[PDB]
Design an enzyme around this catalytic site. Structure first.
Site, short mmCIF file in Angstrom:
data_model
loop_
_atom_site.label_atom_id
_atom_site.label_comp_id
_atom_site.label_asym_id
_atom_site.label_seq_id
_atom_site.Cartn_x
_atom_site.Cartn_y
_atom_site.Cartn_z
N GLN A 1 -5.30 -17.50 -3.62
CA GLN A 1 -5.40 -16.69 -4.84
C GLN A 1 -6.56 -17.16 -5.69
O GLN A 1 -7.39 -16.34 -6.11
CB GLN A 1 -4.08 -16.70 -5.63
CG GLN A 1 -3.01 -15.77 -5.02
CD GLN A 1 -3.48 -14.33 -4.98
OE1 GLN A 1 -3.59 -13.66 -6.01
NE2 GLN A 1 -3.81 -13.87 -3.81
N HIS B 1 0.83 -1.21 0.00
CA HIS B 1 0.00 0.00 0.00
C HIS B 1 0.87 1.28 0.00
O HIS B 1 0.80 2.12 0.91
CB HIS B 1 -0.97 -0.06 1.17
CG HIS B 1 -2.11 -0.99 0.93
ND1 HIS B 1 -2.33 -2.09 1.75
CD2 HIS B 1 -3.07 -0.95 -0.03
CE1 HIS B 1 -3.42 -2.68 1.27
NE2 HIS B 1 -3.89 -2.04 0.20
N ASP C 1 -8.64 -0.86 -7.89
CA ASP C 1 -7.91 -1.29 -6.71
C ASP C 1 -7.28 -2.68 -6.81
O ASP C 1 -6.22 -2.93 -6.22
CB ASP C 1 -8.82 -1.22 -5.49
CG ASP C 1 -8.08 -0.88 -4.22
OD1 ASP C 1 -6.87 -0.58 -4.29
OD2 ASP C 1 -8.71 -0.93 -3.15
N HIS D 1 -6.51 7.19 -2.69
CA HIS D 1 -7.33 6.16 -2.03
C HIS D 1 -6.67 5.38 -0.88
O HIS D 1 -7.41 4.90 -0.02
CB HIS D 1 -7.96 5.20 -3.04
CG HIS D 1 -7.09 4.05 -3.42
ND1 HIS D 1 -5.96 4.22 -4.20
CD2 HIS D 1 -7.22 2.75 -3.10
CE1 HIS D 1 -5.44 3.02 -4.32
NE2 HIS D 1 -6.16 2.10 -3.69
N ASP D 2 -5.33 5.26 -0.84
CA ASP D 2 -4.66 4.54 0.26
C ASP D 2 -3.69 5.45 1.02
O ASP D 2 -2.79 4.97 1.71
CB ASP D 2 -3.96 3.25 -0.25
CG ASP D 2 -4.88 2.03 -0.34
OD1 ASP D 2 -5.71 1.83 0.57
OD2 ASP D 2 -4.75 1.27 -1.32
N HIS E 1 1.47 1.63 -5.75
CA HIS E 1 0.08 1.16 -5.75
C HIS E 1 -0.91 2.29 -6.15
O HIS E 1 -1.84 2.05 -6.91
CB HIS E 1 -0.29 0.49 -4.41
CG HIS E 1 -1.75 0.14 -4.31
ND1 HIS E 1 -2.33 -0.81 -5.16
CD2 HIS E 1 -2.71 0.66 -3.52
CE1 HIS E 1 -3.62 -0.85 -4.82
NE2 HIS E 1 -3.89 0.01 -3.84
C1 LIG Z 1 -5.07 -7.72 -5.80
C2 LIG Z 1 -4.00 -8.35 -4.92
C3 LIG Z 1 -2.98 -7.28 -4.56
C4 LIG Z 1 -3.35 -9.29 -5.91
O1 LIG Z 1 -2.03 -9.61 -5.51
N1 LIG Z 1 -4.54 -9.05 -3.74
C5 LIG Z 1 -4.31 -10.39 -3.42
O2 LIG Z 1 -3.55 -11.18 -3.97
N2 LIG Z 1 -5.08 -10.69 -2.33
C6 LIG Z 1 -5.74 -9.57 -1.96
C7 LIG Z 1 -6.65 -9.43 -0.85
C8 LIG Z 1 -6.92 -10.50 -0.02
C9 LIG Z 1 -7.79 -10.30 1.03
C10 LIG Z 1 -8.36 -9.05 1.20
N3 LIG Z 1 -8.11 -8.02 0.40
C11 LIG Z 1 -7.25 -8.21 -0.62
N4 LIG Z 1 -6.93 -7.13 -1.50
C12 LIG Z 1 -7.28 -5.82 -1.09
C13 LIG Z 1 -6.64 -5.21 -0.04
C14 LIG Z 1 -7.00 -3.93 0.32
C15 LIG Z 1 -7.98 -3.23 -0.36
C16 LIG Z 1 -8.62 -3.84 -1.41
C17 LIG Z 1 -8.27 -5.13 -1.77
C18 LIG Z 1 -6.06 -7.25 -2.59
O3 LIG Z 1 -5.80 -6.33 -3.35
C19 LIG Z 1 -5.44 -8.58 -2.79
MG LIG Z 2 -7.42 0.78 0.78
ZN LIG Z 3 -5.81 0.26 -2.70
#
Ligand SMILES: CC(C)(CO)n1c(=O)[nH]c2c3cccnc3n(-c3ccccc3)c(=O)c21
Ligand SMILES: [Mg+2]
Ligand SMILES: [Zn+2]
Length: 307
Positions: A266, A65, A214, A103-104, A69
């Site tokens: 994933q 973050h 996002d 946003h972050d 990003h």
């Molecule tokens: C999309 C990303 C970064 C792919 O690598 N990713 C992942 O692998 N698991 C997750 C993930 C897993 C659990 C919760 N939020 C997740 N978010 C997330 C975090 C904060 C705000 C919005 C979404 C991801 O972007 C992400």
């Molecule tokens: Mg966020």
């Molecule tokens: Zn974000």
């Protein structure tokens, strides 16, 4: 003073564009995206440049973050806007690119759940969408800095119109809100009741665009996607480490000892979150289809890792 290279002009328009190899050009890339979205005179160059550099400075040295990003999310918004430009007002075009870059803002590398569970001062200040409300507060605070207000030249009613677009867009990046939002939008699309002239509807469409932006690392080419996943897990694992120290066992996803489960996690994330997101977005905005196509491609790559 900065000017972008000729190869990038055409590549920046594509959804799968990776900003990753151009760190020194990111502030300049954002300026270019703004001028292409709402014209060269959309914001006073000096103001806009102060705003960007201040926004950059307020992104911490967290594994995921971070500044990179923010620019990634902004670029994805830029591609969506460009491919559906007439569907959005000049005020929306402006507000959304700014909302994505911010946003972050000032993310500490901890989830809302962590801050709530451990009763962090930020959770005392904001009950729901803890970090998100802090990110919008940080955006207003930066705008209030000397010569940063890029929106000063807008009319009184048009000013509160952007700040409300921004507020709603930043809050919608709270993944917990996404699920209901996507469900309400799927209902409207199927029943044929979805109407972009209706403001509450437009808010939901924007909400989904914010989620789509996002999570856009899932729409890049596999080597980029895989490398971003390492960054997100470095951030999840550090949070888990903190929980362990405080005698709390973290969920598998935040436990570095459970690294083997990442491909399975994933696959679940793509099936439950990412695929539905881009499917719904493509139904509402058909030019966003390459995002769904790239997401499906990466989903196959995660299946191959499991197999
Ligand atoms: C999309 C990303 C970064 C792919 O690598 N990713 C992942 O692998 N698991 C997750 C993930 C897993 C659990 C919760 N939020 C997740 N978010 C997330 C975090 C904060 C705000 C919005 C979404 C991801 O972007 C992400
Ligand atoms: Mg966020
Ligand atoms: Zn974000």
């Amino acid at each position: 003073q900065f000017t972008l290279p000729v190869r990038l002009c055409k590549e920046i328009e594509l959804f799968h564009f990776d900003i990753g190899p151009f760190e020194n050009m990111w502030p300049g890339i954002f300026v270019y995206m703004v001028h292409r979205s709402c014209g060269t005179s959309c914001f006073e160059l000096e103001k806009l440049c102060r705003f960007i550099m201040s926004v950059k400075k307020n992104y911490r040295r967290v594994p995921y973050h971070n500044w990179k990003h923010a620019v990634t999310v902004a670029h994805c918004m830029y591609a969506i806007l460009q491919n559906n430009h007439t569907l959005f007002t000049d005020l929306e075009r402006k507000g959304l690119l700014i909302a994505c870059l911010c946003h972050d803002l000032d993310h500490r590398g901890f989830s809302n759940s962590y801050l709530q569970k451990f009763d962090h001062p930020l959770a005392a200040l904001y009950s729901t969408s803890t970090m998100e409300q802090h990110h919008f507060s940080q955006t207003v605070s930066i705008l209030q800095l000397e010569g940063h207000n890029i929106f000063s030249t807008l009319s009184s009613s048009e000013y509160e119109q952007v700040l409300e677009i921004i507020r709603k867009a930043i809050i919608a990046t709270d993944l917990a809100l996404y699920f209901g939002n996507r469900k309400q939008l799927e209902e409207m699309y199927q029943t044929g009741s979805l109407n972009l002239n209706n403001q509450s509807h437009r808010d939901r469409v924007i909400g989904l665009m914010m989620t789509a932006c996002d999570l856009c690392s899932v729409t890049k080419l596999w080597p980029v996607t895989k490398l971003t996943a390492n960054d997100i897990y470095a951030e999840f694992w550090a949070e888990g480490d903190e929980m362990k120290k405080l005698g709390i066992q973290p969920i598998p996803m935040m436990d570095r000892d459970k690294k083997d489960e990442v491909p399975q996690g994933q696959l679940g994330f793509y099936n439950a979150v990412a695929i539905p997101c881009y499917t719904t977005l493509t139904q509402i905005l058909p030019p966003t289809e390459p995002l769904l196509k790239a997401c499906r491609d990466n989903l196959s790559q995660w299946e191959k890792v499991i197999r």
